[PDB]
Design an enzyme around this catalytic site. Structure first.
Site, PDB file in Angstrom:
ATOM      1  N   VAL A  15       0.808  -1.221   0.000  1.00  0.00           N
ATOM      2  CA  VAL A  15       0.000   0.000   0.000  1.00  0.00           C
ATOM      3  C   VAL A  15       0.849   1.282   0.000  1.00  0.00           C
ATOM      4  CG1 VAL A  15      -1.889  -1.215   1.163  1.00  0.00           C
ATOM      5  CG2 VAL A  15      -0.135   0.056   2.508  1.00  0.00           C
ATOM      6  N   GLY A  16       2.169   1.138   0.011  1.00  0.00           N
ATOM      7  CA  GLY A  16       3.071   2.290  -0.004  1.00  0.00           C
ATOM      8  C   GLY A  16       4.505   1.903  -0.362  1.00  0.00           C
ATOM      9  N   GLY A  18       8.572   4.046  -1.094  1.00  0.00           N
ATOM     10  CA  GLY A  18       9.333   5.306  -1.053  1.00  0.00           C
ATOM     11  C   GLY A  18      10.787   5.115  -0.626  1.00  0.00           C
ATOM     12  N   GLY A  21      11.385   2.897   2.437  1.00  0.00           N
ATOM     13  CA  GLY A  21      11.162   1.447   2.245  1.00  0.00           C
ATOM     14  C   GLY A  21       9.789   1.180   1.620  1.00  0.00           C
ATOM     15  N   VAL A  23       5.505  -0.100   2.799  1.00  0.00           N
ATOM     16  CA  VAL A  23       4.520  -0.551   3.785  1.00  0.00           C
ATOM     17  C   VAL A  23       3.547  -1.504   3.103  1.00  0.00           C
ATOM     18  CG1 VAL A  23       2.667   0.117   5.277  1.00  0.00           C
ATOM     19  CG2 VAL A  23       4.754   1.468   5.214  1.00  0.00           C
ATOM     20  N   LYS A  36       5.888  -2.484   7.863  1.00  0.00           N
ATOM     21  CA  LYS A  36       6.848  -1.590   7.220  1.00  0.00           C
ATOM     22  C   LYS A  36       8.207  -2.250   7.065  1.00  0.00           C
ATOM     23  CE  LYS A  36       8.755   3.051   7.386  1.00  0.00           C
ATOM     24  NZ  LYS A  36       8.814   4.332   8.151  1.00  0.00           N
ATOM     25  N   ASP A 133       9.766  14.843  12.612  1.00  0.00           N
ATOM     26  CA  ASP A 133       9.295  14.693  11.215  1.00  0.00           C
ATOM     27  C   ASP A 133       7.774  14.651  11.148  1.00  0.00           C
ATOM     28  OD1 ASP A 133       9.617  14.555   8.451  1.00  0.00           O
ATOM     29  OD2 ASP A 133       9.913  12.395   8.385  1.00  0.00           O
TER      30      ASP A 133
END
Ligand SMILES: c1ccc2c(-c3cnn4cc(-c5ccc(N6CCNCC6)cc5)cnc34)ccnc2c1
Length: 296
Positions: A15-16, A18, A21, A23, A36, A133
């Protein structure tokens, strides 16, 4: 032991992806979890996040729930609760917000940050923690449309008892788009804990803006844009942000129709008070939390 919780999890959907890494949505005994998988360039974020989650009594509705951490050719995993709506970034992309919902996300996010910042004393307590962050991508939206904060990889801690700032060794820095003026100036005092809290607050103001922009008023609502969308490219260089935030002294435009309401007149004023150039003039997370519920 977290060892075998990593062994039984089946990975179903990515689902992710970048620089951090990837997810994945994973299945563990019927329920859904987030897994993750960290990139090699971000191993130190996994370490810091593993240390904090194992070491600090942090459980809270508005902080991403931790399940396990594993070293499962080399690969570092963090397994947590899964939230279908994804990040606040994702949610704000697709959805528009009724004022009531805008406040719900805003208040719950503020609860998360206040909880991080405030030291709780005693056996069941916790040190004061700054995120470093904070951004809409690092805030998830739950089923009950309340937020919870994620990604503790850059976090710094401090007790009132012992004055030495517990800092990791991570080379990673805050996301540039969200860096406060004092971070871009390199004028921040890196041996003072309060400073790092004040950068969380700046970033929080920028996240409010993102929520505000996406809120319906008089049947007007804008399409989603990130903060400073009108002044910097996609992956802004430090230098792009330095120019905009420090030299040009720019802050996101507060909707020129932000004050034509009751519940969303204050949000505009609160936005302003996260963005004061002098960091100590800014509101604290506790004060933001309180104002938010004070106006419901
Ligand atoms: C920062 C943020 C999150 C995490 C997470 C994390 C936990 N849950 N979770 C869910 C998503 C996610 C799920 C579904 C979607 N979509 C479905 C709806 N339509 C939009 C696309 C998008 C995103 C991403 N990351 C996570 C785990 C570990 N470190 C983190 C650090």
């Amino acid at each position: 032991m977290q060892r075998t919780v990593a062994r039984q999890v089946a990975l179903v959907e990515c689902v992710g992806k970048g620089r951090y890494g990837e997810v994945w949505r994973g299945l563990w005994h019927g329920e859904s979890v987030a897994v993750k998988i960290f990139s090699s360039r971000d191993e130190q974020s996994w370490f810091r996040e593993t240390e904090i989650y194992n070491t600090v009594l942090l459980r809270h509705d508005n902080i991403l729930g931790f399940i396990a951490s594993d070293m499962t050719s080399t690969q570092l995993w963090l397994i947590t609760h899964y939230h279908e709506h994804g990040s606040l970034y994702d949610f704000l992309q697709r959805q528009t917000l009724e004022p009531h919902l805008a406040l719900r996300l805003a208040v719950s996010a503020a609860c998360g940050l206040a909880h991080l910042h405030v030291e709780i004393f005693g056996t069941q307590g916790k040190p004061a923690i700054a995120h470093r962050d904070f951004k809409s991508r690092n805030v998830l939206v739950k089923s009950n449309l309340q937020c919870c904060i994620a990604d503790l990889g850059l976090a710094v801690m401090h007790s009132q008892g012992s004055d030495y700032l517990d800092i990791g060794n991570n080379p990673r820095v805050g996301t540039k788009r969200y860096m406060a003026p004092e971070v871009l100036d390199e004028q921040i005092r890196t041996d003072c804990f309060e400073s790092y809290k004040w950068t969380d607050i700046w970033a929080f103001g920028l996240v409010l803006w993102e929520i505000a922009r996406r809120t319906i008023v008089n049947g007007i609502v804008e399409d989603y844009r990130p903060p400073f969308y009108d002044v910097v490219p996609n992956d802004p260089s430090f230098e792009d942000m330095k120019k905009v935030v420090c030299v040009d002294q720019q802050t996101p435009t507060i909707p020129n129709r932000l004050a034509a309401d009751p519940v969303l007149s204050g949000l505009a004023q609160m936005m302003r008070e996260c963005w004061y150039p002098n960091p100590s003039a800014r509101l604290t997370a506790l004060r933001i939390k309180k104002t938010l519920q004070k106006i419901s």
